[PDB]
RNA sequence: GGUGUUGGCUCUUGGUCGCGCCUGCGUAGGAUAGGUGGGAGCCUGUGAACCCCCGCCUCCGGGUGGGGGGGAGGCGCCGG
RNA sequence: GGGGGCCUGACUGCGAGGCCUGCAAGCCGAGCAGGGGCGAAAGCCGGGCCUAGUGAACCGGUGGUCCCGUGUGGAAGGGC
RNA sequence: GGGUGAUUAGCUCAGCUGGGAGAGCACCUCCCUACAAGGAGGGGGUCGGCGGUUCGAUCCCGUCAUCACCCACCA
């Protein structure tokens, strides 16, 4: 899946061909093709454990601007997935 | 990336000094290794407000030290102990220095912040020096009979 | 000996890379030449194009409000009327065709072409090959057209220019001559480059712009910013 | 192949475009005269010529320069 | 049909009336104006003695054109 | 079309970043040997034609021509 902040995700629009011309005329070949976000995990302390995002190249440092965020929050309680889940 | 670190690693600069740099530098060292922050603008007039306390504390403890300078050196100090005739019985230590502006004066400065290594047991207007921050020397007149 | 201590000389007063004004800046180029008993005005600026694409020769002719100056003795070569029609002035005692040889051996003391294309097949045999890139070959395009060669020997006292651009755009102004006023050092650049933006060549990727300078025979040289 | 994921340190190499610099070699002709356009003065008494070091190229012939106490003349016209 | 001279009518704007024929085509053509060639003039010249030597339409290049040109003025594209 | 390249004797071919076209095989003969190695002479060339710069071009430059390779634009 695509996941994350980005709320990015697969489309599948389509990818074709043309020949060049354009001074005459362009040629045509078409098919349909997925195209993807460039989704990488992303690593994070926040004091304890660390936590991964499958998140995208347009909006990594949200995740630097939300942990900047948490700083006097209740971070804690044991419960590092339910951290993520906390974040926002 | 607009970052200020507060170690001053010799190849980004002095601390103070936010430098970009490139993100991976950033994302996989500083931070996490607590060499620099995210100088957002909430991260930047937050310890830009930091320098601006610092920067200017240094007046309600520097001053008031001047408001008492060209005070404090105009007066004399009188500690009367029955003593020898050019060596004094026993002593006076800083620690006991202090009361005798309470006793007297009814001042009260620090002991510990004067100068004073050792007690003194020989008499004379002596003077002495004063530390009520280290910035502004005042020296101190006392005197035992 | 080596190269001179004086060429080290009015250049630390002239601040060379900057602006000057060009025109107003002339008055004062008038104490930085400082020169023997004349100047001239070098504009040169190198094309920025190739000395072959076919032949671009380029040929033409200039103004120039007053003139030149001294003498180039002209002398020309014709048979019949032909300079019947042009001896009052550039042209004297020719003759004919029992004189060449003074080219050859009699007078050596000749410049200045003027004359008419009547008798080629004797000149292009004779001096049709060791001579001419000196700067001469009676052409068109350089004094040498026809009956119109009438109002040539007194355009003389007009203008001259070769537009050999060659293989290094090259191009001269050579007329300046100091103590002609400074008027004639002043106001002659631009209808000098108004000739000179004339039948430039054709099809090229690049500028038309150079350097320019505006130089004395011996003056200064270091640029200048050329516009006006 | 390019780019984002992608970060620190360093050695070198090619090219492009300006600048400051090294050259430019048939015979003839002092001589090793790239090209074009002017050009008669140019330099010199804030310094030239006959004399020591060095560098670069080099066609062994020299061409080009930073250097020495010396201190009045040397190249260009033109000829060929 | 074979030679010589002067020429560019292998013109422009039209074009009655007709051969053939399903359509599209194809083919001949007197007559006029602008301007010209030849000939003293009558006159002829809208390619070649003729019948074969060719390609609808769509798309696009090049040159002109009182044209259209998106709120308006240029521009871009289109149109003849 | 766009650009890299050739091409010179009969032949497989050099010329050097400009300066009288040449080494081999083949052809004629003369030699020492009778053959065939091997030498000495001479002939042999439109430097693929056409041009431009150049005092001067096998070489510098631009179209042709016959190729070869690569990328299409053909309604
Ligand atoms: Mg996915
Ligand atoms: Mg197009
Ligand atoms: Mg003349
Ligand atoms: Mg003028
Ligand atoms: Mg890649």
């Known amino acids: 899946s695509g996941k994350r902040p980005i709320v990015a995700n697969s489309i599948q629009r389509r990818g074709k061909a043309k020949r060049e011309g354009g001074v005459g005329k362009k040629t045509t070949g078409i098919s349909k093709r997925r195209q993807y976000p460039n989704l990488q995990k992303v690593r994070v302390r926040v004091a304890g454990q660390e936590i991964t995002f499958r998140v995208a190249a347009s909006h990594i440092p949200k995740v630097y601007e939300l942990v900047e965020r948490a700083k006097g929050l209740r971070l804690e309680g044991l419960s590092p997935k339910e951290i993520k889940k906390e974040l926002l | 990336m607009k970052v200020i670190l507060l170690e001053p690693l010799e190849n980004l600069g002095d601390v103070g000094q936010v430098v970009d740099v490139k993100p991976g530098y950033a994302r996989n060292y500083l931070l996490p290794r607590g060499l620099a922050v995210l100088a957002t603008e909430s991260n930047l007039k937050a310890l830009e407000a930091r320098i601006r306390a610092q920067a200017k504390r240094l007046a309600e403890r520097k001053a008031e030290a001047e408001r008492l300078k060209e005070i404090l050196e105009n007066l004399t100090l009188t500690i009367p102990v029955r003593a020898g005739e050019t060596k004094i019985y026993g002593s006076v230590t800083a620690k006991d220095i202090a009361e005798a502006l309470s006793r007297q004066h009814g001042i009260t400065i620090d002991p510990k912040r004067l100068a004073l290594e050792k007690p003194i047991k020989e008499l004379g207007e002596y003077v002495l020096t004063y530390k009520p921050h280290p910035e502004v020397p005042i020296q101190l007149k006392v005197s035992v009979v | ?64 409000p007053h003139g030149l100056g001294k003498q180039v003795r002209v002398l020309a070569i014709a048979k019949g009327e032909k300079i019947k029609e042009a001896e009052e002035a550039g042209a004297d005692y020719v003759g004919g065709e029992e004189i060449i040889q003074k080219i050859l051996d009699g007078w050596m003391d000749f410049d200045a072409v003027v004359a008419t294309p009547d008798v080629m097949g004797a000149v292009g045999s004779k001096l049709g090959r060791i001579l001419g890139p000196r700067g001469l070959l009676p052409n068109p395009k350089a004094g040498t057209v026809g009956f119109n060669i009438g109002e040539i020997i007194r355009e003389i006292k007009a203008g001259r220019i070769e537009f050999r651009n060659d293989k290094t755009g090259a191009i001269h102004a050579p007329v300046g001559k100091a103590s002609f006023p400074p008027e004639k050092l002043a106001d002659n650049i631009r209808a000098f480059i108004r000739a000179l933006e004339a039948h430039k060549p054709e099809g090229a990727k690049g500028t038309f712009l150079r350097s320019v300078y505006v130089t004395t025979t011996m003056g200064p040289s270091v640029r200048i910013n050329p516009h006006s």
């Open chain 3, 1 to 64: 000996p080596k190269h001179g201590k004086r060429y080290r000389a009015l250049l630390e007063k002239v601040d060379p890379n900057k602006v000057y004004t060009i025109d107003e800046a002339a008055r004062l180029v008038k104490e930085l030449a400082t020169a023997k008993f004349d100047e001239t005005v070098e504009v040169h600026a190198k094309l920025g194009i190739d000395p072959r694409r076919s032949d671009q020769n380029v040929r033409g002719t200039v103004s120039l």
